[PDB]
Amino acid sequence: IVGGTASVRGEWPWQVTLHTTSPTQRHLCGGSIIGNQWILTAAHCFYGVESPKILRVYSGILNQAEIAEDTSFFGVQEIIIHDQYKMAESGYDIALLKLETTVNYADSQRPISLPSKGDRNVIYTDCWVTGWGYRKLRDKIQNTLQKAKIPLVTNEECQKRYRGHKITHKMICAGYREGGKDACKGDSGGPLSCKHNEVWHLVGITSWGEGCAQRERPGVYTNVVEYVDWILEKTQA
Ligand SMILES: *[C@](=O)([C]([C][C][C][N]C([N])=[N])[N]C(=O)[C]N1C(=O)C([N])=[C]N=C1C1=[C][C]=[C]C([C])=[C]1)C1=N[C]=[C]S1
């Protein structure tokens, strides 16, 4: 996260850090708890991943330092990538992780509500992007979960900032015309929490962007609401 600040412990209980154990354990991507056994994240986060066996999901984490060999974690039983996904920049950057065991909800870990179709007209004025990603280009995973408030921008406005790309309605962007605050390498799969009516909503999933926090280069996110039907279909046994 660029231009952000340290999060308060438990402030974003749906945020999880997804690790890979190969070759050695390290943070790979962010993710959001949306069910007792489901993590919603980015599909482009599994590039080079042949098996869910090397994945580990940690919930209720603030500092990566809390993660040691003796720290409990959730195994991943199955990785579900949207069948239309090809690459982050083309859209459909959405994936579901089915955990091997269920998450016991607590103040440190609980699920975030998915947006409803009857909310595409809602004016989210209080949105935040969170993660352990870079604070800039060519950096490294940060220890303390970072947070940054960032305004959503219209699709028409985002398209202007990304000529050469096709910003569809299944994407949503956010950022400052002047840059300064934004997601970065490592925040991928992270949630884009929007506070609307004393209630948090998973509006987007950190997907891509040109560089990090550059001026006139909004972060691009998966427009979650466009996938509630997909999410329902894939999570029902
Ligand atoms: C991510 O967290 C990053 C976050 C980048 C978001 N940046 C801004 N300014 N909002 N995601 C990517 O690197 C995804 N990505 C791109 O954004 C671009 N421009 C080109 N390629 C990719 C990409 C696609 C598939 C696989 C990879 C490794 C990169 C991370 N996601 C994985 C590691 S860090």
From Swiss-Prot:
Glycans are attached at residues 63, 104. Transmembrane segments: none annotated. Changing residue 16 to M: In FA11D; dominant-negative mutation that results in severely decreased protein secretion. Disulfide bonds join 29-45, 127-194, 158-173, 184-212. Heparin binds at residues 160-163. Residues 1-236 form the Peptidase S1 domain. The active site is at 44 (charge relay system), 93 (charge relay system), 188 (charge relay system). Changing residue 31 to V: In FA11D; mutant is not secreted by transfected fibroblasts; dominant-negative effect. This is Coagulation factor XIa light chain. The chain holds residues 388 to 624 of 625 of the full protein.
